Structure formats: C-alpha cells, structure tokens
Design a protein around this nucleic acid. Structure first.
Ligand SMILES: [Mg+2]
Ligand SMILES: [Mg+2]
Ligand SMILES: [Zn+2]
Length: 712
RNA sequence: GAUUGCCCCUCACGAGGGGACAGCUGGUAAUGGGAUACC
DNA sequence: GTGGCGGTATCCCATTACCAGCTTAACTACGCG
DNA sequence: CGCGTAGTTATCGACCATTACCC
C-alpha cells in the first residue's frame, strides 16, 4: 500500500464525505489537469452518506459467433499472458512492470518472449494485465491475512489466558505462500472470461456483410432509436384458435372441471389478476421468435459476436427501471458498457450503471455491541421492525416480529407477532426432498441399463431378492428362527439380532469387538459396544461380483457427471431458500407498516449445521438408499446474509448461546428446561413452543443489547 | 400486465399459475450420499 | 466451534463454505470516405 | 470533415466475539 496525492487533498478537506467511484474518477482527472484548487469546487456539492457501490448483474444469451471462443486473438493472448505470470517467482514479479501505455506493452511483450497472437488494445490489455497481476498478488495477500488472523487470535488468547492460568502457547510457525525456489505453490488457474471494454462495447446490431446470421434471422431490422413495442396483447382472450398464445375457454374462468379423456377434478385459478406479472410470449415458429429479438454486436477485429438482449429487457422490466416505451440504445445505456462474456456457456453478463440502478452493500453484518448502537441511531427518527429468526429441522424458520421505538435513554421493544412460514413452502421443502430421491433412483435405474445383457440380468435378479437372501442366510448360518425375532422394528442402533443370537448363546467371540478410537480431538479408553443389527445386515448382504460392480458403478459415475438434474435441484433449493426469506420479509413489512426491516439471525457457524440423510427403521430399508434429509439451515442463513448486500438490508448476527434455553420471564438458564419442541421452565412453570416463542423472544432480547446472555 | 432464458406445479399440449433474479472465475476445505475393504 | 452413525483406509459423485480475483468511461487523437 | 478505430488517463480506505445449537 502506497499513499496517493488525491487521498491527501480529500482527507485534508473532506474527512467524512466519501464519494462513489464515478465522481472519484472524474474528480481525480480534474485535480491533475486543472490544478488542486479546481477539484474542491467539483467535489463540494455532490456527495452521499452511503454511496451505492453495488451493481446487480443481468444475463443474456449469445446468438452466433464468427468462430469458437479460444480461437480469438484476445482469448489466446489472455491465456498466454496469464500462464506466464502465474509461473513467475516472487522476486521476478517485482521486476515485471507491464506499464499502461502502448510503448511499454510492446517493451514487455519483447523482454519476456510471451506472444500476443495479433491483438494489441491498450485498454483491453490493461484490463487483462491488472486482473492477472491481481490474482497473483491475491493468493499472496490471502495467506498473509490468514496468517495475521491466526496471530490476532493467538494474541488475544495469551493475554486473557496468561492471567487466569499459566499455560499459553508462545507462538506458531509462519505459513508461507512460496516454494523453496521462490515459485508459487497452488497458484491460480486461468480464467476464461472475455472482459469487454470501451473500444469494443456492445452496440445495437446493424447489418454488415461479414456478420451472417442463422437462416431464421433472415430479415432482422430494428431501428435502435425506436420504442420497442410490447409483445403480448393486453387481453389474451382475443387470440383466435389458430394463432399462438391461445388460452382455451376452459382455462380462462376460475373453477374446477374434468378433462374429457381421463377425467380429473383440477382447480384452474384463471387469468392472474396481477399488475406486475411477467408476460409470456408465444410465436408460431422459431423464425418469428428470432425476428422479435434484441440483437447487439461486439466486434474486436476480424471476429465478431452477436448477443440477444431480451435477457436485459426482462431484468429491467422487472425492477421497473425501464419505461414502457424504450429504445434499444436506451436499454443499453441502463447497463455498463463492459459485459463479461461466459465462453463455456455462451452467456453474457451485463451489470447496471450506478445511475440506472445500484444500491449500497454493507460489507459485514453487525454483531456484538454494534446491534444496540445501530438501533440507537435507526430508532432516533423512525420505528424499525425486528424479525428474529431461529433455524431448525422440525420448524425450518420461526420468526418473531417486534417494533422497536425509543424513549429517552431506552429502546422500548414492542413484541408484535411470532409466526412460522406457511404449509406451501413446507410442502415444497418436502417435495424438493422427494425429487432428490427420485432423481437418485432414476440415475441408479439408468445405470442398470448401461450394463451388458449378462451382467444386467445378474443385477436385476440380486436386487430383487437382496433382502430376502440376507435374511435367510443369516438365520440358516446361526440357526435363528425368523418368526421369533421381530423384523420391522430394526434400526441403525438396535441390537435385536444379537440378543436372539445370545439367547441361543453359541459364543461371545463373534459379536463383541474393540472399536478403534476415532482419530479426533477426544481420546478416551475405547468402549466395547456390542455390534448392532445394521452392521450384521451390511455384512450379510449378497455381494456382487467385482467385475460387474466396477462396470456398474463406472456407468453411474458417467451418468452422474453429465446429468442436467443436479444443477436443476441446486438452483431449486436456493430459490426455495430465497422464496422463504421473501415471504418472511414481505409479511413483516405488511404487518409492521415500516419501510425498514432489519432481520435478526443467530450467529450459527454453518459448517456444523448440515444434517444427514434418513432411512426409515426396518429390515426392508437396510438395503435401500438413504432418503435425502439435509438441512436448509445453510441455505436460509446465507439468504438472510445476502439481504445485507443485495438490498442493503441491515443484518444482525448475535450469539445464540442460551437463547433456546433461557426462560423468557426469568433469568434462569438451566439446560434442562428445553426438551425438543416443548419448552418448560423449571422455576416458574410455563409451557411455550421452544422454537416459536422462547428462542425468538430471547434472540430479540440479546439483539436490543450487545451483552451476551448471562451465565448462571 | 413485463417478448428470450432459468426454477416449480397443472395441462384438454393450445397453454395456465407461481417463484428466484448477485453473479462469474480460481485456489483450498468441509459436508452428504454411494461402493469396496478391514479390525 | 461436530454427535448417540461401530471404527478405519481407499476411491467415486454431488452440493456447499471460505477467501482471493473480478464485473468504467470521458476526453483526445489519427488514419480513411 | 465525420466517423470508425483506438490510445491516455483518471480512484480503489472499517467490524464483534467465544461451553452451546440443531438433530
Ligand atoms: Mg436457536
Ligand atoms: Mg429452534
Ligand atoms: Zn422461568
């Protein structure tokens, strides 16, 4: 880090009037050009307390290219530069200055021997050069901050510990980012991003002969300064029989009816009575669809690319920052002129300008004593809603809305409403877990179809009688009568088989064993636990031939790697976690009738909130796969922390030490009050839903005050 | 009442209803599932 | 800063978490029509 | 002379807090 001259003049005149980037860039030029005295007159008027420093992304689709990416001089030049910089040492990088001018660019390209495959744009190269130099220095800073963070952690532990006891670790070994020879161990990989820049920025398609479009875009005309018409008609009940987009009679009116072929009672909600509904357009053929696109081009040389900007139009008509009449050029001016083309997916990611859209993004969620002090400011003027969130698996989210107001030197926190998210979102959570299991079973059932006809028959036969074979084999080997022993009440930790075994009392050798102590933090004398029925069931299932198993599982791996479903589900769970924090926020906002909602979530370390899958106890279900039951705690924890930056929300991370335990009424925190989802204090006998009422009541009370919950 | 795409559901396959919209890379690390092996 | 899955060692696959990198543009200049 | 292509040259700043919490 090196001080700048510009920083001095601002710090000397504007201590606390930080400005956003666009004014900073323009302001720097004026100072350097028109002297130091002329920058104040530009920077005195316009400034903001919290300047928007975040731009949402918008994604569109590539239509056609001149040739495949990575066949372009910029893409080859970027790769050649990148893999040269990542294999430099620390000392060599210090004497590697690729300066920002055209003259120095060539001096660099010659002094090192790296080639540029016919591409030299000073700005475009400068973008690549800084980003590559940035990544190389980033992996070196990253260790240093982590090294600093451990040192800071050690620093606290010694001073605090050294007064209560003697033991204190003196120090620890420095973690380096370098090899013995100076090189970079685990150096960054190249990035395949076509970073578009100003001299190349997208602009509305006009027909040039080098650019040739697929046969569907036969005549593409679009006056870039005309207002783009609206696709759908205003009343979709005029569309006739033939034309596309025809809503049939039975589907307009709400009600229930039976289809003519089979007959099922299906509720039809009818046309949506909504005013911000996205409109879906339908063309007769794929040629009409193309002529109603928004094509803009990006030319860098003898190789171009055409992209379809309907994606940006939807993303702008959803945020309602685009008038109903708008031109193609106006749409492009709503976004920055530097897209990021994704070459391996043919997707271009625009972002909004700070003027068109853009919000402040708080870097961190406030914790500790910042919670009280933040409410001290925000309640000085208006009242702020306070939703307290407590995650679980019986009830995914439990929320309590309060209404903090301020009287002199206190924050009256009115409790308003405790609720949980509705059954529809619970139904989708259940349906998401069923879809995952269905996906897994289909992949398994299609890996069987990848076997040759001989091994296929073996697998089909064995799986059908797998449970029957194990049952009969176990009984015959140890003589146990199947009927005397209950089967359906078999779990992962029951010991029914052994007790029937021990009732015969053949020997004690075969059952008891000496569990090897698990490598871990905790070591004791090793327990002698008797082996369970799940272990017996596993060890007696009929194993499949090694060769067929190698072939069968290799087929599954191939199907699994190239399966579109896991992306489908991973987005599905994320959007279902986000949908469940929007209900929460919108419900509290329509109830508290306040603009500003600051949700309060527990400071749970998501690494240990993952959960597990589930098998129903039983003998039949030892040989089936585990139904997936992973927790949404990580999803919903991240979704609230994302409200912090995506929508500039305040977020409160507060330690949930005794929140689920400490009785609301009294300060007595014994661990035995909680029993699951039935709380009961053991001094002032009281019954509340541990999740809904005591956990949220206590979370809010540790929010209004920085102090952590009292202990004894 | 917003032209593509993406996610979920219904469908008389004409379509209808609802949902997400901060995303890319890269290096590491966990987590869950599946298979074998062994005390 | 993991719990009631009996422990460990190989792999295989998926998705996350965590922390690095990113996600302009006005003004000016010069070779062609 | 005007317009498509393109080089120069401008800014990058911070946080709390430690024996439970969900199965
Ligand atoms: Mg809790
Ligand atoms: Mg709870
Ligand atoms: Zn009590």
């Amino acid at each position: 880090a090196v001080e700048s001259e510009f920083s001095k003049v601002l710090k000397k005149h504007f201590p606390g009037e930080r400005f956003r980037s666009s004014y900073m860039k323009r302001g720097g030029k004026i100072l350097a050009a028109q002297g130091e005295e002329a920058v104040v007159a530009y920077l005195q008027g316009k400034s903001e307390e919290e300047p928007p420093n975040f731009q949402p992304p918008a994604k569109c689709h590539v239509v056609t290219k001149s040739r495949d990416f990575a066949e372009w001089p910029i893409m080859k030049a970027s790769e050649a530069i990148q893999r040269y910089i990542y294999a430099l040492s620390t000392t060599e990088r210090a004497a590697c200055k690729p300066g920002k001018s055209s003259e120095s660019h060539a001096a660099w390209f010659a002094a090192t021997g790296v080639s540029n495959h016919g591409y030299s744009h000073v700005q475009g190269l400068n973008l690549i050069f800084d980003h590559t130099l940035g990544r190389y220095d980033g992996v070196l800073k990253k260790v240093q901050l982590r090294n600093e963070k451990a040192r800071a952690r050690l620093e606290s532990i010694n001073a605090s510990r050294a007064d209560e006891g003697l033991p204190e670790i003196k120090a620890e070994e420095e973690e380096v980012a370098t090899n013995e020879t100076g090189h970079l161990l685990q150096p960054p990989g190249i990035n395949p991003s076509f970073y578009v820049y100003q001299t190349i920025s997208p602009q509305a398609y006009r027909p040039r002969d080098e650019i040739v479009l697929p046969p569907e875009y036969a005549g593409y005309v679009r006056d870039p300064n005309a207002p783009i018409p609206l696709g759908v008609v205003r009343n979709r009940c005029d569309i006739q029989k033939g034309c596309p987009g025809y809503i049939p009679e039975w589907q307009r009116e709400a009600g229930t009816a039976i289809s003519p072929k089979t007959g099922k009672a299906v509720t039809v909600p009818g046309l949506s009575p909504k005013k911000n509904k996205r409109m879906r357009r339908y063309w007769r053929s794929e040629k009409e669809k193309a002529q109603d696109a928004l094509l803009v081009t990006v030319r860098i040389g003898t190789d171009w690319v055409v992209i379809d900007v309907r994606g940006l139009l939807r993303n702008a008509r959803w945020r309602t920052i685009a008038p109903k009449d708008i031109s193609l050029n106006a749409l492009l001016d709503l976004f920055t002129g530097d897209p990021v083309i994704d070459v391996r997916r043919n997707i271009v990611t625009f972002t909004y300008t700070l003027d068109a859209c853009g919000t402040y993004a708080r870097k961190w969620t406030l914790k500790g004593k910042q919670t009280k002090a933040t409410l001290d400011k925000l309640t000085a003027t208006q009242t702020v809603a306070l939703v307290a969130i407590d995650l679980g698996q019986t009830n995914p989210i439990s929320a309590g809305i309060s209404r903090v107001t301020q009287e002199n030197g206190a924050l009256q926190c009115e409790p308003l409403d405790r609720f949980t998210l509705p059954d529809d979102l619970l139904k989708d959570i259940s349906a998401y877990r069923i879809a995952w299991d269905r996906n897994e079973e289909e992949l398994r059932a299609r890996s069987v179809e990848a076997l040759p006809e001989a091994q296929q028959a073996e697998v089909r036969a064995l799986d059908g009688v797998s449970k029957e074979t194990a049952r009969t084999q176990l009984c015959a080997d140890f003589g146990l009568d199947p009927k005397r022993l209950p089967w359906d009440k078999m779990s992962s930790n029951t010991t029914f088989i052994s007790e029937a075994l021990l009732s015969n009392s053949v020997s004690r050798d075969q059952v008891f064993f000496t569990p090897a102590p698990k490598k871990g933090a905790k070591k004791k004398a090793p327990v002698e636990v008797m082996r369970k029925d799940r272990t017996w069931a596993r060890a007696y299932k009929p194993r499949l031939s090694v060769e067929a198993q190698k072939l069968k599982n290799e087929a599954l791996w191939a199907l699994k790697r190239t399966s579109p479903e896991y992306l489908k589900l991973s987005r599905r769970k994320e959007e279902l976690c986000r949908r469940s924090i929007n209900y929460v926020i919108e419900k509290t906002r329509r109830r508290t009738q306040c603009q500003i909602v600051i949700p309060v979530i527990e400071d749970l370390n998501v690494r240990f909130f993952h959960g597990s899958g589930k098998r129903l106890p039983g003998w039949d279900n030892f040989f089936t796969a585990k139904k997936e039951n992973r927790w949404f705690i990580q999803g919903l924890h991240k979704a609230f922390s994302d409200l912090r930056t995506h929508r500039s929300f305040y977020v409160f991370e507060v330690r949930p030490e005794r929140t689920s335990i400490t009785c609301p009424k009294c300060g007595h925190c014994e661990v035995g009050n909680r029993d699951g989802e039935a709380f009961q204090c053991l001094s002032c006998g009281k019954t509340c839903n541990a999740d809904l009422d005591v956990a949220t009541h206590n979370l809010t009370q540790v929010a209004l005050t920085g102090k952590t919950m009292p202990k004894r």
